Design a binder for this molecule. Sequence first.
Ligand SMILES: CCCCCCCCCCCCCC(=O)OC[C@H](COP(=O)(O)OCC(O)COP(=O)(O)OC[C@@H](COC(=O)CCCCCCCCCCCCC)OC(=O)CCCCCCCCCCCCC)OC(=O)CCCCCCCCCCCCC
Ligand SMILES: CCCCCCCCCCCCCC(=O)OC[C@H](COP(=O)(O)OCC(O)COP(=O)(O)OC[C@@H](COC(=O)CCCCCCCCCCCCC)OC(=O)CCCCCCCCCCCCC)OC(=O)CCCCCCCCCCCCC
Ligand code: BCL
Ligand code: BCL
Ligand SMILES: CC[C@H]1c2cc3[nH]c4c(c3C)C(=O)[C@H](C(=O)OC)c4c3nc(cc4[nH]c(cc(n2)[C@@H]1C)c(C(C)=O)c4C)[C@@H](C)[C@@H]3CCC(=O)OC/C=C(\C)CCC[C@H](C)CCC[C@H](C)CCCC(C)C
Ligand SMILES: COC(C)(C)C/C=C/C(C)=C/C=C/C(C=O)=C/C=C/C(C)=C/C=C/C=C(C)/C=C/C=C(\C)CC/C=C(C)/C=C/C=C(\C)C(=O)O
Ligand SMILES: COC(C)(C)C/C=C/C(C)=C/C=C/C(C=O)=C/C=C/C(C)=C/C=C/C=C(C)/C=C/C=C(\C)CC/C=C(C)/C=C/C=C(\C)C(=O)O
Ligand SMILES: COC(C)(C)C/C=C/C(C)=C/C=C/C(C=O)=C/C=C/C(C)=C/C=C/C=C(C)/C=C/C=C(\C)CC/C=C(C)/C=C/C=C(\C)C(=O)O
Ligand SMILES: COC(C)(C)C/C=C/C(C)=C/C=C/C(C=O)=C/C=C/C(C)=C/C=C/C=C(C)/C=C/C=C(\C)CC/C=C(C)/C=C/C=C(\C)C(=O)O
Ligand SMILES: CCCCCCCCCCCCO[C@@H]1O[C@H](CO)[C@@H](O[C@H]2O[C@H](CO)[C@@H](O)[C@H](O)[C@H]2O)[C@H](O)[C@H]1O
Lengths: 273, 62, 73, 72, 39, 39, 39, 39, 39, 39, 99, 180, 58, 60, 58, 58, 60, 56, 58
Amino acid sequence: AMLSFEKKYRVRGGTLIGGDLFDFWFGPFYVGFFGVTTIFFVTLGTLLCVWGAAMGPTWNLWQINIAPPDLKYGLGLAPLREGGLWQIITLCALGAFGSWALRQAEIARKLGMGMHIPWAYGGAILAYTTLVVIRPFLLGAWGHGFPYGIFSHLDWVSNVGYQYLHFHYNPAHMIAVTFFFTNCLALAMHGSLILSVTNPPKGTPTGTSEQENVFFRDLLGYSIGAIGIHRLGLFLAVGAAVWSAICIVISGPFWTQGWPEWWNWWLNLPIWK
Amino acid sequence: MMEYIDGAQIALYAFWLFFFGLIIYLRREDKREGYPLESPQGPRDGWPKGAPKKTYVHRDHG
Amino acid sequence: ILAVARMGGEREIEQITDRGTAAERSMLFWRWCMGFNATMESIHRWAWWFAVLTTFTGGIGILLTGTVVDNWY
Amino acid sequence: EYQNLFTRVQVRTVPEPGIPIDESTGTRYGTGTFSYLAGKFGDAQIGPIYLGWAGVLSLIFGFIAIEIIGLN
Amino acid sequence: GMTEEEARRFHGYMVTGTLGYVVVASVAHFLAWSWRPWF
Amino acid sequence: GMTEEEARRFHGYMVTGTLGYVVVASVAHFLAWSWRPWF
Amino acid sequence: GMTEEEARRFHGYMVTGTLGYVVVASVAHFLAWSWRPWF
Amino acid sequence: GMTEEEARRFHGYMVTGTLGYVVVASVAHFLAWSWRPWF
Amino acid sequence: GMTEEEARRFHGYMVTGTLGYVVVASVAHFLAWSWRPWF
Amino acid sequence: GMTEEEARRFHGYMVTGTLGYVVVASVAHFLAWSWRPWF
Amino acid sequence: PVNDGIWAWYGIDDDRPMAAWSRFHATRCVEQLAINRARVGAAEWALADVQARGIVPCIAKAAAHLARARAELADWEAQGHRLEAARKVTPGAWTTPVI
Amino acid sequence: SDVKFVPADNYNGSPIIPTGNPMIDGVGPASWAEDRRDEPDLTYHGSHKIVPMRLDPTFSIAKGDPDPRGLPVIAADKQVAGTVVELWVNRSEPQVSYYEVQLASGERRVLLPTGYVQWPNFGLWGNDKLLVKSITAAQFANVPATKRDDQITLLEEDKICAYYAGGHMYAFAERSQPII
Amino acid sequence: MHRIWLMYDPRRVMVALVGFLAVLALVIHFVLLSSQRYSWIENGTLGADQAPVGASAP
Amino acid sequence: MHRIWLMYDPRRVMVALVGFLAVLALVIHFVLLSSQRYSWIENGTLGADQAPVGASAPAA
Amino acid sequence: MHRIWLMYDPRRVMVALVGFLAVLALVIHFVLLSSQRYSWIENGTLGADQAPVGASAP
Amino acid sequence: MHRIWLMYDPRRVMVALVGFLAVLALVIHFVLLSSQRYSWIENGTLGADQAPVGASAP
Amino acid sequence: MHRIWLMYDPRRVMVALVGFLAVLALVIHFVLLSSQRYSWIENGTLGADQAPVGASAPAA
Amino acid sequence: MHRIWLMYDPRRVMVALVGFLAVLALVIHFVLLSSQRYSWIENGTLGADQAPVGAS
Amino acid sequence: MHRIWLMYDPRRVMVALVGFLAVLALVIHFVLLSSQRYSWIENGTLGADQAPVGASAP
Ligand SMILES: CCCCCCCCCCCCCC(=O)OC[C@H](COP(=O)(O)OCC(O)COP(=O)(O)OC[C@@H](COC(=O)CCCCCCCCCCCCC)OC(=O)CCCCCCCCCCCCC)OC(=O)CCCCCCCCCCCCC
Ligand SMILES: CCCCCCCCCCCCCC(=O)OC[C@H](COP(=O)(O)OCC(O)COP(=O)(O)OC[C@@H](COC(=O)CCCCCCCCCCCCC)OC(=O)CCCCCCCCCCCCC)OC(=O)CCCCCCCCCCCCC
Ligand code: BCL
Ligand code: BCL
Ligand SMILES: CC[C@H]1c2cc3[nH]c4c(c3C)C(=O)[C@H](C(=O)OC)c4c3nc(cc4[nH]c(cc(n2)[C@@H]1C)c(C(C)=O)c4C)[C@@H](C)[C@@H]3CCC(=O)OC/C=C(\C)CCC[C@H](C)CCC[C@H](C)CCCC(C)C
Ligand SMILES: COC(C)(C)C/C=C/C(C)=C/C=C/C(C=O)=C/C=C/C(C)=C/C=C/C=C(C)/C=C/C=C(\C)CC/C=C(C)/C=C/C=C(\C)C(=O)O
Ligand SMILES: COC(C)(C)C/C=C/C(C)=C/C=C/C(C=O)=C/C=C/C(C)=C/C=C/C=C(C)/C=C/C=C(\C)CC/C=C(C)/C=C/C=C(\C)C(=O)O
Ligand SMILES: COC(C)(C)C/C=C/C(C)=C/C=C/C(C=O)=C/C=C/C(C)=C/C=C/C=C(C)/C=C/C=C(\C)CC/C=C(C)/C=C/C=C(\C)C(=O)O
Ligand SMILES: COC(C)(C)C/C=C/C(C)=C/C=C/C(C=O)=C/C=C/C(C)=C/C=C/C=C(C)/C=C/C=C(\C)CC/C=C(C)/C=C/C=C(\C)C(=O)O
Ligand SMILES: CCCCCCCCCCCCO[C@@H]1O[C@H](CO)[C@@H](O[C@H]2O[C@H](CO)[C@@H](O)[C@H](O)[C@H]2O)[C@H](O)[C@H]1O
């Protein structure tokens, strides 16, 4: 089916690879060449996840756990029961996430939009690629990746944190947390302002950009404007993921002690050493 | 006394019932524009059925 | 919104009251990407509820801790 | 392709908003001003704030809270 | 939309494929049953 | 939408299919009870 | 919107469906009770 | 679009390709069963 | 797109590249088998 | 853009360069095999 | 500085008043003369338009803007004359005149 | 024909093919919201929101930014399209909304939305010409007109923005094709 | 009390009622299934005197 | 008293009332089901003399 | 009764109903396959008196 | 019974059916392959008397 | 039977078919290569009298 | 079978096929490279009777 | 065979080829450098008899 205004927009063009061959829709979904590759990697990766569950101890959704190999295998592919299945699924996930980004570019090109969405999603792909590729590769073993399991990856996060005794003291982590918290605040403010001028109390005219700028101005002391709040939201949300990737890649490859003792440089500034 | 049922489990299902109710509400709101859908088989609503298209009253100025 | 800002998509109140091609393209992008879409108004409700539920579910979890459950593991 | 990430041409207006929409009781504090740096990323006006009775008391109560923490 | 003649014509193939599939599945079950019965 | 006459025609199929399904499920429960009773 | 006639006709089916439902629930509860009473 | 003659011509290739592929798979299973049977 | 006579000419090269590739692979497999059989 | 004549000229270089690279790489393998053979 | 921008941090500044010959300052001057003459042309067109539609406070600003555009042009014409004088006395300078 | 496009074929989910010039007819990325209200957008106090800066004496360019007036506009085919002669400002949120360009040929003035203008070095220096990647200098002649020279309707804002949005696909026949 | 169907659209009320009953029945069945006394899938064949009971006052 | 229905739309009130009553009923049942004395699913067959009681004053 | 199909589009209800029955059947089967007594894949060949039973009262 | 294909487009029903049967078939095979008794890749050559049986009641 | 190609575009049924077969073939190979009995890269040279067979524990 | 190219214009799908083959070859090599029996970089010189077998 | 260059822009193919071969060379060197037998920066001076070999079959 189509939105009442949609049909006019469904032209050919804007593809990156396939030309007209895959330039069609399936229900609501645009396909394209990277749609085909997406569904390939999604299906293969999903069915291998189901196989991992089948050969594991339970079907309980929360307890399924497909673990990476032991560190002794280094950068080789382990036996599939022993973590090689995790390594294949990781390749499928990279293939799927990459295909999804490039498919979004084909869609943006067909609509004459800017490329912002593909790149903003690249911030998440960067963070994933850091956790499963870049950081494991710098540590010299694929076994440093997180396990694929709804709670077992939380056991990994816990243990990686305490590998540095008190992970809250990681300075890039403090920045990343600040971005996540500031983003959620900014999202609530922006959502509230737009809804408050479009849904004023009954018997009140629809509001205006002037009213939301006046309200925003006496909240923060300055008016950010309509383009400004969207630039800020993009900056905060994507900046959180980028600082997240930094905070985890410095932990291990570049810093090995507890994080609290990193702050020794601040105590030793010569003005007060 | 109930061994398995506990107050954290009860509270969690209360949230799930609310949250699915919320998703239904949000999907009705998502359908105020562009619906009903055009199709070869005639108009289509999906599910849930969208809320009606909303009229906005502008101000008389001063 | 930045991707449609050149078409006036950042004038969100007017895109809500007087839908332009910037809103239509925004709806079609997400529809064609993931099979469903919001509206220029209703995306701000998704935004509002996600932010609000962060701290609301948080508070419930704190209140349950040490009063109903003493060991979450 | 222009990314729309920062504003290469700002415009000033000599009279200004910042004088609020019709608001009744309380007082508008300060005069509006423009920051060129604010104008690069967002709207340039840094300007007047409203408190009323609840805003004044909130700052008094909050300042004391901040003083007690810092002094300790 | 389909003519009722076209619906009639499609329904013959649809029943025949369903029957064929059910036969193949029935043979598959009886092979599985002969090798390792589940009751 | 439907006329009342079309609604009446559909109701015949719907009730018959519903009752047919319940009969098939009734035989399934007969077989299951005879294999391993739950009370 | 319903006429008051359609409302009053629909109400008759609704009362009847409710009664049929409460009857089945009553039998179900008495089957449950005689198998394993809760008071 | 494509005509019923084009559809019929394509179908003949499509059925043949499927059956040839199934034949090749059959010989692969014959070889694998000779090497290490699974029942 | 291309005409049928173009498609025939392209197919002639594509088939020959496929046979060439398969021949190199066949020698590669027989070298590997000679070195270290997998059955 | 391109022509039969232009394509032929480039193809001559592209084939020659590719084969030249493979020749130099085969001498590197000869040197590596002499230093420390892998089978 | 709008023209040299970031390069003003490293002391490239081809806008500054120059009386010796300099091909960089002459290049900047030739570019800015064309832009400012177009800008004066647009300013006096805008005055003619707003005079025709008669709005008094807008006519005042359009005339004030035009005067500023003429003054900013006159500075570049002065720069052009300095460089053109220096061109004639300096070996290896341009053969095409500034201004 | 009074239909702007036709299906590429009979199958579900097939693309449409424009029957004429898509940039002019408004198909694909050149489309606008054709039922959009043909009235000016208004400020809180009820005046016209978007106006030529010539008609609001409170506005001016900020200190330290280039004045775009008098700059040449360089189109997608590297030809000069024209010169900027005026700015249109949004009065509810002070912005330049459109550049008004005196065309080098045929002496139309056309509007150019600021979201389609790139400054030469991301604006870090130079700042002496405007780059318009979306359309060629010839295509500037067909930018949709504004039925008055001192106001713009919400419908006209959609037509103009849609015309440049279509250029990223239709300005050259190659722009529809893949990169491989 | 049929004017309730003038007050509320019966198409909406009847879907509300179906959803309410579906949720409530599922809640009650899963509560009972999580008990000891009524864990009927494991223990439904026990006689009424053999079924579990919670502890008394001492 | 009936002019309360002129202040308040009964179509809103009946929904708000049903919502309140359903929440309140579920809250009370689950509070009782969590108690010792009234965990009736597991202990409902106990006689009133043998149902649990909270401990009396400890003479501390 | 047939006037219910004037209140609800039968094309929509049939899709809804097949969706409900598919989910419900999968839920019931997975509840049983989780259980001890009805793990029929592992223990379905046991006689009815050999199949597991939950604990009685002592 | 063919007028079911007037209420529903066969092109859509066959997509839904192929999707449903694909998922259901893969579910059942992986469930069996996860079991002890029907782990046929490891144990398919055991006879019926040799295959596992889940623990009986005492 | 051939009118299935008037219902569906053969150009993309063939894409969906080939992709399904590629995904299926890769799954079955990775499943077999995960097993002990059919881990053919490591043990393919074992004769059928030496190949692994899985059993349950006796637990007598 | 040449009519296949009238469905699938080769200039749009050769880079598809070649991308498929290159990734598949790399996967197969890496699967072999870290098996015990075929880790030829470390053990390629052994000869077949000395090469590992992953017997249970 | 040269008509392949009428399908594909050599300016882009030569970039794609050189990129591919550069990545491939860099991978093969890193695989060898990470090995035991061919970690030539540390052990390159060892004679071919002295160079490491992986374990045989026990
Ligand atoms: C889950 C993971 C997380 C992710 C989790 C999230 C998942 C998100 C996805 C959820 C599902 C989305 C479904 C959707 O959007 O459908 C749009 C479609 C459009 O409707 P329409 O526009 O009105 O009609 C279309 C139709 O008329 C024409 O289709 P078209 O010609 O364009 O394309 C053909 C199709 C496939 O064709 C067929 O399936 C029929 C083939 C002939 C069958 C003959 C009988 C066989 C009998 C057996 C004999 C056997 C012996 C011969 O495919 C295409 O060509 C399009 C491209 C497909 C995508 C590219 C694939 C690339 C290759 C990789 C493939 C890998 C394997 C999938 O709708 C419909 O057709 C009706 C609804 C269909 C529902 C399908 C899903 C049902 C799943 C049920 C599961 C229930 C579990 C409880
Ligand atoms: C804890 C914090 C959570 C935080 C995260 C929370 C995430 C919340 C957002 C995601 C959920 C919304 C997704 C959505 O609305 O998609 C549109 C779709 C259909 O759109 P439509 O406009 O109403 O109808 C279109 C139709 O009329 C014409 O389309 P066409 O003919 O071209 O194609 C045929 C349709 C057939 O429909 C389907 O195949 C449905 C596919 C599955 C629907 C969702 C099931 C539940 C989630 C997935 C479970 C399976 C997942 C593996 O084909 C399509 O329309 C395909 C496009 C929709 C694809 C949606 C994919 C969503 C994936 C969500 C993944 C969630 C992962 C957790 O809607 C529906 O089918 C009904 C959705 C109803 C709301 C969902 C919540 C229900 C709560 C329970 C209430 C009681 C039971 C309903
Ligand atoms: C070892 C550490 C523990 C842990 C311990 C806790 C604890 C303890 C808590 C959280 C909480 C939260 N945790 Mg946790 N958390 C861990 C791991 C994680 C990880 C992770 C990747 O591992 C993540 C992403 C999170 C994420 C989160 C958030 C979802 C949640 C806070 C929501 C929020 O908005 O708070 C930020 C928002 C606020 C605090 C609201 C503040 C609003 C007020 C009105 C602001 C007043 C400002 C005032 C005017 C100015 C004051 C000035 C000064 C006086 C000078 N946790 C591990 C398991 N986490 C909270 C929660 O909800 O738990 C259920 C919580 O209490
Ligand atoms: C110039 C046009 C032709 C060419 C024309 C000839 C001719 C003519 C002769 C050879 C001969 C040979 N060529 Mg040739 N050859 C070319 C390209 C190549 C390429 C390549 C990667 O493209 C390679 C690996 C070779 C390799 C070879 C050897 C098999 C052989 C002599 C040894 C040799 O390598 O000398 C080093 C050469 C190279 C690495 C590359 C080519 C260098 C130049 C262009 C040719 C040098 C010829 C050499 C001086 C012999 C002179 C013979 C007298 C004039 C009679 N040629 C080009 C495409 N080649 C000779 C032969 O058959 O010997 C048995 C021979 O007579
Ligand atoms: C939906 C969940 C998210 C959320 C939302 C949210 N927060 C909010 C809001 C919203 C929607 C507001 O509207 C409100 C606000 O005002 O935002 C600007 C606020 C707010 N969120 C705040 C913080 C905050 N939010 C956080 C988080 C979150 N906020 C969540 C992520 C966090 C975290 C992550 O830790 C923090 C720290 C504040 C900035 C603000 C509430 C401000 C407030 O209450 O201030 C009280 C006053 C004081 C503490 C005193 C200040 C003292 C002065 C410095 C003294 C100066 C001298 C004075 C003049 C003397 C008096 C003389 C008199 C005579 C005048
Ligand atoms: C782990 O245990 C758990 C899983 C938990 C336990 C639970 C399990 C559950 C709940 C299972 C439920 C299963 C189920 C329920 O009903 C299963 C139902 C299955 C069904 C119905 C299968 C039907 C198959 C039909 C087929 C294959 C038809 C093929 C048709 C063909 C080939 C012809 C196509 C048409 C043509 C060619 C005409 C062209 C001409 C045209 C167009 C013209 O000429 O016009
Ligand atoms: C331990 O686990 C827990 C979960 C806890 C335990 C508890 C579980 C609980 C609480 C379960 C509750 C279950 C329940 C409650 O109501 C279940 C209710 C089930 C119901 C209602 C089933 C109804 C089935 C109806 C069917 C199949 C109808 C088929 C109709 C057909 C085939 C006809 C199609 C039409 C045609 C052919 C006409 C075309 C021509 C046309 C149109 C023309 O000509 O116009
Ligand atoms: C771990 O264990 C688990 C995995 C869990 C166990 C379970 C496994 C399961 C459930 C498996 C299910 C498998 C299955 C189910 O159906 C498998 C079904 C497979 C099928 C259908 C295969 C079909 C293949 C068909 C092919 C190859 C066709 C080739 C056609 C060719 C070559 C010619 C094309 C035509 C041309 C070129 C002419 C153009 C002319 C034109 C255009 C003209 O002239 O116009
Ligand atoms: C556990 O899992 C694991 C371990 C992985 C196990 C499982 C592995 C599995 C399942 C593997 C499956 C493999 C497979 C399946 O099909 C593999 C299929 C492979 C195939 C198809 C190979 C085909 C290659 C063909 C080639 C190279 C052709 C080249 C042609 C060339 C060069 C000529 C180009 C044209 C010219 C020059 C003419 C221009 C003229 C023009 C334009 C004119 O004249 O106009
Ligand atoms: C790029 C040169 C350095 C790397 C050389 C690699 C080793 C092989 C050396 C072979 C001799 C030089 O390489 C040889 O040069 C000639 C002339 O330039 C190329 O000739 C090519 O261009 C000429 C231009 O006049 C065309 O007329 C001719 O049809 C075409 O093949 C040959 O195709 C190539 O084989």
